[PDB]
Each structure stands twice: as structure tokens, then as C-alpha cells.
Amino acid sequence: DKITFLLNWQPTPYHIPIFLAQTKGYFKEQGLDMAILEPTNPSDVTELIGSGKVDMGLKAMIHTLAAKARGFPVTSVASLLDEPFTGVLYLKGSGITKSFQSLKGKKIGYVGEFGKIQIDELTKHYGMKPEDYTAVRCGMNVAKYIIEGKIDAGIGIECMQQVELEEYLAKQGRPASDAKMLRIDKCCCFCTVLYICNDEFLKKNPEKVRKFLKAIKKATDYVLADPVKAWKEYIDFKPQLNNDLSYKQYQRCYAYFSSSLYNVHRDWKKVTGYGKRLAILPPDYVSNYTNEYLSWPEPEEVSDPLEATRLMAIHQEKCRQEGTFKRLAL
Amino acid sequence: DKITFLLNWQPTPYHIPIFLAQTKGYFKEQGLDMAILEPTNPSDVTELIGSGKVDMGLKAMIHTLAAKARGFPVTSVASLLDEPFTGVLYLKGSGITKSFQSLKGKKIGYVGEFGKIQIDELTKHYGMKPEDYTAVRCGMNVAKYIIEGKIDAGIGIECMQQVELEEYLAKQGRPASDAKMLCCCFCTVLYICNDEFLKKNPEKVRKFLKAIKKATDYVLADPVKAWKEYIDFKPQLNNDLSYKQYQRCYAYFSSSLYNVHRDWKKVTGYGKRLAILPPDYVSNYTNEYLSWPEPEDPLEATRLMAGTFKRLAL
Numbered sequence: 001d002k003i004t005f006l007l008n009w010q011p012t013p014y015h016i017p018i019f020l021a022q023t024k025g026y027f028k029e030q031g032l033d034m035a036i037l038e039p040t041n042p043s044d045v046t047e048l049i050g051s052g053k054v055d056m057g058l059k060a061m062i063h064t065l066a067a068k069a070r071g072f073p074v075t076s077v078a079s080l081l082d083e084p085f086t087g088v089l090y091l092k093g094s095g096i097t098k099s100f101q102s103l104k105g106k107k108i109g110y111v112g113e114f115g116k117i118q119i120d121e122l123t124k125h126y127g128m129k130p131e132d133y134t135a136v137r138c139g140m141n142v143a144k145y146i147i148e149g150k151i152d153a154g155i156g157i158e159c160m161q162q163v164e165l166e167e168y169l170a171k172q173g174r175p176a177s178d179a180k181m182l183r184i185d186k187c188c189c190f191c192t193v194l195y196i197c198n199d200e201f202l203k204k205n206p207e208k209v210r211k212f213l214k215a216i217k218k219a220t221d222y223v224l225a226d227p228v229k230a231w232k233e234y235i236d237f238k239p240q241l242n243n244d245l246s247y248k249q250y251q252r253c254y255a256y257f258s259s260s261l262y263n264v265h266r267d268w269k270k271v272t273g274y275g276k277r278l279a280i281l282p283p284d285y286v287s288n289y290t291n292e293y294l295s296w297p298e299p300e301e302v303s304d305p306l307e308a309t310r311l312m313a314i315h316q317e318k319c320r321q322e323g324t325f326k327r328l329a330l
Numbered sequence: 331d332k333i334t335f336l337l338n339w340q341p342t343p344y345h346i347p348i349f350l351a352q353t354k355g356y357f358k359e360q361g362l363d364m365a366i367l368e369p370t371n372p373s374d375v376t377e378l379i380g381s382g383k384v385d386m387g388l389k390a391m392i393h394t395l396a397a398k399a400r401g402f403p404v405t406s407v408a409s410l411l412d413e414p415f416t417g418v419l420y421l422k423g424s425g426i427t428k429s430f431q432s433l434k435g436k437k438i439g440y441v442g443e444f445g446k447i448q449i450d451e452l453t454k455h456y457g458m459k460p461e462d463y464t465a466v467r468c469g470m471n472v473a474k475y476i477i478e479g480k481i482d483a484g485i486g487i488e489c490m491q492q493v494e495l496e497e498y499l500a501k502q503g504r505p506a507s508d509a510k511m512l513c514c515c516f517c518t519v520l521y522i523c524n525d526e527f528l529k530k531n532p533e534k535v536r537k538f539l540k541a542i543k544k545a546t547d548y549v550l551a552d553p554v555k556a557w558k559e560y561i562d563f564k565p566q567l568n569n570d571l572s573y574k575q576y577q578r579c580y581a582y583f584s585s586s587l588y589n590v591h592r593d594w595k596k597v598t599g600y601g602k603r604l605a606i607l608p609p610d611y612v613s614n615y616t617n618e619y620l621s622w623p624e625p626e627d628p629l630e631a632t633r634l635m636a637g638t639f640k641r642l643a644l
């Protein structure tokens with residue numbers, strides 16, 4: 001009678017609120033017995049949770065959408081990481097440029113099936129065809145394969161893959177600015193990371209989920225309030241994250257953590273749109289999320305979302321060169 | 331309709347045969363879709379597999395025995411790592427010595443549950459009581475906590491924890507010999523199934539072990555190419571520590587995957603004496619799902635076993 005929680009990824013700096021809810025005894029104090037699991041292949045995640053083999057976990061906004069469409073009943077009950085910049089990453093002199101036309105004849109890596117689906121469709125809007133470029137499945141190793149020259153560019157998150165590149169560049173004495181991203185946003189909300197449940201599990205255990213999120217909230221607060229003490233506890237438990245790369249990633253993640261855990265309606269709306277257009281989702285498809293199991297007031301919708309996004313881009317650039325923990329102010 | 335396989339630990343060098351069976355397409359070529367999972371806490375493992383939430387996994391012989399006793403129906407269907415030396419590891423100048431009496435007043439780390447039970451019971455055979463010593467649960471971090479001085483000694487495997495200590499010693503300029511250890515079959519690592527799953531899918535398990543066998547062969551035949559593939563997929567293992575661990579593991583890999591009857595017999599005994607197992611308890615393993623012939627002085631082989639890749643010769 002343990003509850004299974006399956007991450008989207010190998011342990012990352014942004015899983016901290018979950019591991020801490022464990023180590024600090026927050027889950028225990030709620031009468032929950034959580035069995036946190038890590039996947040070897042993110043591709044396995046939605047299917048396992050949808051099929052009820054696993055009770056809860058995390059995945060990106062899009063995959064959560066595509067999961068129900070593809071027949072796996074999952075519902076997003078909370079939000080972990082909000083709108084992290086996603087895009088095609090590449091090193092300067094790849095030789096790739098700001099023009100999506102440079103992707104011609106290049107090997108471009110992706111993790112998920114959907115990353116291919118995304119690139120495949122972008123090629124049409126720029127005159128080229130799949131395939132005037134080679135798509136390579138790289139799973140959790142996109143950045144790594146970039147650095148080793150097995151691919152020319154690949155899909156990733158600004159606060160994970162991009163950092164891994166910058167740290168590599170620092171070794172080569174190159175400047176961090178040489179790590180570049182063609183943003184798919186320029187709705188970067190596709191890679192928002194969500195707390196998801198099996199629909200059936202949620203139906204039968206509403207109160208346990210509510211309690212789960214209470215524990216998650218308590219830890220999320222701690223992490224945002226005192227990121228440094230938090231980080232020390234985290235890496236004491238998960239030493240594989242006790243390196244400089246992981247810490248820099250952690251700092252870049254700080255500004256993207258959701259403080260409220262609320263699903264953002266606007267974002268879901270946008271991505272569901274994207275989803276229908278890409279043919280990933282049926283015409284009558286309905287967004288599979290809910291804020292019902294959150295036990296604190298919803299925050300006010302961001303007044304000007306597109307300015308907050310270009311403000312974040314700046315904020316994150318400052319984080320890179322100052323090495324700080326600051327929340328984006330509005 | 332994926333099959334879930336849950337490892338006993340974070341990815342380790344000795345999981346190589348499984349990951350390779352995945353990356354090399356051996357599972358695929360058997361029409362199996364395996365979802366390999368890694369636990370955050372080894373202790374969660376047998377309960378998850380026993381309860382059917384997870385189909386298959388790895389766990390150590392003692393755990394697998396105690397699992398059925400404790401009400402979780404699992405069956406060992408094959409063997410991954412045979413009789414790795416297990417014991418209490420400590421650094422010279424701990425100050426701990428060959429005499430178990432030195433454990434008095436020391437902080438002693440154990441991984442989850444069974445280690446405390448083991449130490450607790452050893453203290454009686456040497457005149458001391460639980461607790462003339464402090465037991466500390468360390469999970470997958472025993473060696474790490476030893477190095478940092480949070481504990482004085484802790485329970486571990488010669489080819490994993492001990493190596494982690496030796497590598498630390500090399501950094502301090504100390505000699506490897508300064509890493510010391512006080513039926514070592516209790517920590518044999520097994521391929522286990524949920525009893526119900528095995529009942530309903532006998533042929534898939536048989537095919538699973540075929541894939542595992544193919545990869546195990548490759549690993550033993552050409553350990554170096556194997557290792558390169560493994561760490562290409564799992565970069566966290568691409569370091570010198572992991573490679574040294576890998577080399578120490580090489581001699582312990584089971585080439586045949588067969589459960590060893592003698593070993594199970596011994597540990598079941600141990601199990602009953604420790605009260606972990608009921609009096610009428612019956613060993614929960616089987617070689618039925620292996621599809622190749624079973625192989626033919628155990629105590630001399632053990633003292634014979636005590637930077638190369640060589641199999642122990644007999």
C-alpha cells in the first residue's frame with residue numbers, strides 16, 4: 001500500500017521539492033508512504049502512470065496532454081516548473097545561426113518523440129522538408145551528444161541543457177555566450193513540468209493527493225525561502241547532484257519554480273491549441289488538469305504575460321553572470 | 331502493456347547486463363517492452379514487486395527470502411551477482427580492528443533494515459548488547475558517510491563500497507590496504523518476479539532471461555566494449571570509481587544465471603535462526619525459466635576468490 005511517484009527524468013536539481021518532502025518527513029507527517037521512482041526512459045513515463053501501474057509522477061505539459069489523447073488517462077493536479085525556456089540549443093560555429101534555415105543538413109537531436117514532431121513541423125513554416133535535416137533520438141543525453149559532436153544541435157531547457165553547455169564552454173575557455181538557443185517560443189509553456197496522477201487513482205484517493213500536495217507545498221516553500229540550506233540537504237541524500245554543474249542548474253531553475261503549484265489556465269489553453277494544430281490532439285479535446293486538490297488561494301493571473309517572459313530572459317541572464325538566487329519580480 | 335523492471339539500487343556497474351539488453355535491442359528482439367525503473371529507496375523495492383505494482387526487479391537473497399515471509403509474494407527466477415563479499419567496512423585508524431569488540435561505542439551504518447538485524451544479532455555472539463553501539467540507517471550512502479566521518483564503520487559490498495573507500499584513500503595518499511572489512515551469499519543479487527506475474531506470463535519471463543543471457547555473455551566475453559556502451563547510455567557511470575567497481579564486479583557476475591541451491595539452502599537456514607523466516611518456510615526460487623543446461627569445494631573457491639578482467643578459475 002505504498003504510493004508510487006515516478007519522476008520524468010533522472011534526478012535533476014528541479015526535483016528538489018519532492019526529495020525534500022521525503023527526507024524532511026513531510027510525506028510521513030501526512031500519513032503518506034511514497035515510493036519515489038526514477039525512469040531510465042522518460043518515454044515510458046506517461047504510459048506507466050496512465051495505465052495505473054504507477055500512481056503519480058511528473059511530465060511536461062504537452063506530454064500530459066498527448067497522454068490522454070493517446071489513450072492514457074492522466075490528470076495534472078499541480079505545477080512544478082513553470083515555462084522554462086525551451087528551444088534548439090547549439091554552440092557558436094556549429095555552424096548554426098539565428099536563421100532556422102541553417103538547420104539544413106545538420107544532425108539535430110531530440111529526446112522525446114514529440115521533439116521530433118515539433119522540429120518536423122517547424123521545417124514546413126520555413127520552406128524546408130522533413131528531411132532536409134537528420135533527427136536523432138538522444139533521450140536524456142542531448143546536451144552531452146552536442147558537446148561530443150554526435151549532433152550539431154538539439155532540443156533542451158535553458159536551465160538544464162544550456163547550463164551543461166556553458167559549463168563545457170568554460171572548460172574550453174570559450175565564453176558562456178557561445179551557447180545559443182533558437183527558441184520555439186519565439187507558449188514556451190510546452191515544457192512546463194507538472195505533478196500528474198492516474199485518473200483512476202485520483203478518483204479513489206482524492207484526500208491522499210490533497211495531502212501529497214500539502215507536503216509538496218511545505219517543501220517548495222522551504223526551497224524558495226532558503227535555497228542554500230535546502231540544496232545542502234538535497235545533495236546530502238543524492239550525492240550525484242553534488243557538483244558545480246548541478247548547482248548552476250539549480251540556480252537557473254530557482255526563478256522557474258512555481259511558488260503556488262497552481263496550473264496556469266492561460267498556458268494550458270495555449271498548449272492545447274498547439275496540440276490540436278499539430279494533430280497530436282483531437283478537435284474536441286479537453287485540457288486534463290485541475291486545481292481542486294490545492295488547499296490555498298489561487299494567485300492573480302499575470303497582467304502582461306509577454307513582458308514577464310522577456311523580463312525573465314533578462315533575469316536569467318543576470319543569474320548566469322551573478323550566480324544568485326532571485327525570484328522574478330512583477 | 332509495458333513490463334516494469336525495478337532495480338535494487340541506483341544504477342551500478344553490476345546492472346550492466348540489463349541496460350545492455352535494453353540498448354542493444356535484445357529485449358526488443360524478444361517482443362518485450364521493458365520499463366526499467368530505479369528506486370530512491372532499496373527498502374521500497376520488494377514490497378512494490380510483491381504487491382504486483384511492479385512486475386520484476388533485482389533484490390538480494392536475504393531480502394527476497396524475507397519478502398515472502400513478510401507477506402509479499404516474489405520468486406527468484408535467476409541470479410545476477412553471486413556471493414559478493416559483504417561485511418562491515420571501516421578505515422584503518424577508525425579506530426576499529428579485526429576484533430568485533432571494537433564495535434563498542436562506535437557508530438555503525440547499515441543500508442536499510444536487514445543490516446541492523448544482522449549486526450544486532452552478531453553482538454550477542456560476542457558478549458555485547460544492542461546497544462553498546464549506535465546503528466545508523468544510511469541507505470545507499472554507507473561508504474560516503476564513512477568517508478565523511480558521520481559513522482565509524484558500515485555494511486557494504488567488497489566490489490562497491492570497499493572500492494569507494496579505496497579510491498578515497500588514494501586521494502589522501504593512504505594505501506588501499508587501509509580500507510578494511512570485518513554464507514556471504516546473503517548479498518547475492520537476484521532477478522525476481524511477482525508470483526502472480528510469473529504465473530500469468532511464464533513465456534515472457536523465459537524470453538526476458540534469454541535477452542539477459544545474451545547480454546551477460548557479451549559483458550563477460552568483451553567487458554571493455556560492453557562498458558563503453560553502458561556509460562555512453564548512462565554517463566553518471568563514466569568515471570574512474572565506477573570502472574574500478576566494474577572490474578571488481580566482473581568475477582562475481584553469474585555466467586549461467588542459475589540460482590545456486592547450496593547458497594539458498596544456507597541463507598534460508600540463517601533466515602530461520604534470525605527469526606526472519608518461519609519454521610516451515612520454503613525457499614522461493616526456481617531455475618525453470620532458464621533455457622540452457624545447469625552447470626556442475628565451495629569454501630576453497632571462496633578463499634581463492636579473496637586492474638584486470640579475469641574470471642575465477644577452478
Ligand SMILES: *Cc1c(COP(=O)(O)O)cnc(C)c1O
Pocket residue numbers: 338339372373388389390393440441442443444445446517519
Ligand atoms: C535492499 C538492499 C540492501 C540493504 O537493505 P538492508 O535491509 O539494510 O540490507 C543492500 N544491498 C542491496 C543490493 C539491496 O538491494
